[PDB]
């Protein structure tokens, strides 16, 4: 691509000389004339006005404003730093005199304040716990986590890249295609962060509390299509 398109305002969202619209439109549509900003929400927070419910959904005006502006990956990382306390209340606030107590600011969080799962975690014989785990128990019992792969892709490629002879394009490739905050979320804290979190005089939180990359479904193949020969093949592939 020519740098006219890829760098110098042929991209509508990126502000600069020769894209005078984008900086204005970024500020006004995301902040000034934006319904989710706390100053706008605070005008609508009452009566039958459109944010009336916000009082009861267990989220701040700041949290409503973050959830409207961050993408579903960033929100999923923020969701890692949170606790199922309404599910713990189901364990504790239990007797008739507890009157199924719920924080009034969390009143509408009905389906998490009451559901069977949390109780099944806590009972001494896990009948409803095991019933909710059948699918993954069956999967592992069949050994499908350990059986060799019977197929793989015959070809594999890295993503296509824009080639543009500007330094900004190279910087942007690193910012997006090798995105630091997403990578840090997936792979978690660095070794000095673990030291600095562990030896301090007071506790401290970490950007992700843990590595957020999932466990691989296959115990031996993991996240790669590399395969390794074995003695079973070696014995049997000569008659």
């Amino acid at each position: 691509l020519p740098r006219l398109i890829w760098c110098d305002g042929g991209r509508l969202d990126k502000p600069g000389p020769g894209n005078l619209v984008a900086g204005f439109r970024s500020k006004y549509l995301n902040h000034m004339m934006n319904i989710w900003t706390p100053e706008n929400i605070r005008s609508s927070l009452e009566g039958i006005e459109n944010f009336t419910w916000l009082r009861f959904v267990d989220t701040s005006l700041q949290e409503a404003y973050r959830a409207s502006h961050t993408d579903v990956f960033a929100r999923a990382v923020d969701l890692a730093s949170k606790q199922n306390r309404l599910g713990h209340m189901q364990i504790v606030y239990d007797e008739p005199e507890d009157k199924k107590w719920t924080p009034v600011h969390a009143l509408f969080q009905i389906c998490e304040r009451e559901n069977p799962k949390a109780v099944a975690e806590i009972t001494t014989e896990g009948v409803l716990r095991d019933l909710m785990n059948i699918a993954r128990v069956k999967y592992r019992e069949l050994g499908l986590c350990r059986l060799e792969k019977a197929a793989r892709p015959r070809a594999s490629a890295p993503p296509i890249e824009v080639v543009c002879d500007s330094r900004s394009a190279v910087i942007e490739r690193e910012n997006i295609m090798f995105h630091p905050a997403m990578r840090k979320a997936l792979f978690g804290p660095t070794p000095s962060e673990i030291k600095e979190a562990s030896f301090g005089p007071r506790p401290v939180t970490l950007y992700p509390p843990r590595a957020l990359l999932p466990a691989p479904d296959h115990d031996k193949q993991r996240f790669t299509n590399i395969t390794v020969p074995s003695m079973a093949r070696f014995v049997t592939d000569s008659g």
Binding site: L128, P203, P214
Partner: protein
Amino acid sequence: ISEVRGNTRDHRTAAHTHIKGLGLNSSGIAEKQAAGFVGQCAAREACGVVVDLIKAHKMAGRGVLLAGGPGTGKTALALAISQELGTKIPFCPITGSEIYSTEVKKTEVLMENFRRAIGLRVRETKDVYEGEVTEMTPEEAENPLGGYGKTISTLLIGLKSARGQKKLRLDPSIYEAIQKERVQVGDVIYIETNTGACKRVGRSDAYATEFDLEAEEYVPIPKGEVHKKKEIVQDVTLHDLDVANARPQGGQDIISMMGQLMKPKMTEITDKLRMEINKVVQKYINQGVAELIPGVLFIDEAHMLDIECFTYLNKALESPIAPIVVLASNRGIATIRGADDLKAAHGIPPDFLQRLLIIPTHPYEPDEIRRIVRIRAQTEGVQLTDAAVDRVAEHGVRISLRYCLQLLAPASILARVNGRTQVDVQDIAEAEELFLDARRSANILTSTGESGGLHGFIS
């Protein structure tokens, strides 16, 4: 915090609010007027056997058809069955219209509702310690390990509930939970004996004045015993087990967490999962720790199902763990919705119709209509003159039961805006003239819509 409303908490009223049951003797014979029913004595006796079939838990996947004209009480009988069974028995009502999901094939929607209609009751013991943390105190070990600065043999926690105080001599490993949950003195926690860990509910509101500002909510002290051991009864449908297995909820990873933040579309769950669920459910039933509760799937306007739905119900009804299915239809001889050249009775395919116990509901005599008018009036709280009861029942005979019942609320208002608490003929005669029935409205369409060029109906 929230301002309680003190004055009134009375019920609303809907088309079937008067129906309280099937109104049957201990012999099962129908009483001619009971539990809000008038007449239908044969259909009520048949539905009484259906209630006994369901309540006996012997049988799976029997079909029932309520057959009869519109307004003949078929949904009244279904709602009466649900009330005779009581809320412990699952009752899943749908129309046949509700099966046409955009997210999944309509046979999955039908099978979801089919397994919503099957309940499971599981009895377990819950066993936890609870309170605000009054104290936390290590015990040094008598044989400390070499090279380590401290060795702890016990970790004492004081727990206080509203009803007592106890010193828990815990295993030292609970340090892990205390650090990770950040348990302080004055925090409300529980410890569960099946793990030995703890979880933090919050800070006790006994401490809500520690600071002018702190960023946490405060929670009441537990109003139970400090040690809660009791049996708990959990009711789940087998559909709840399908979803709990096909869409696991608790996942800690990025993909699970992005998942629970996005639109949670339903999915065409496999027979392999449902069969594996059935086989493990049956293990626990044979162990006696769970009991199956077969309920009712009620399909209203069952003539809205198509031939693909019915041919699936053949398979579904043959499975060993299945509800009783009740269908209702009023469509005479009609085309099957998916087979534009097959006409059959009830709009039900003849192949499928052979499976069903069929219950006919007949029309009402004028005196039955008049009795229903009085039952409906005393349910809507309307007070009538006997001449007004007769005039309303006349519309019930000449026009429709539904139409005459629907005039009672307009006439009640028209009476009180003349200062009268009792509705009389003058009010009925105005309600019936403000509020037309279908047929008189259709006569206006025929008369004024004789031409369409201007001021005429669109046709």
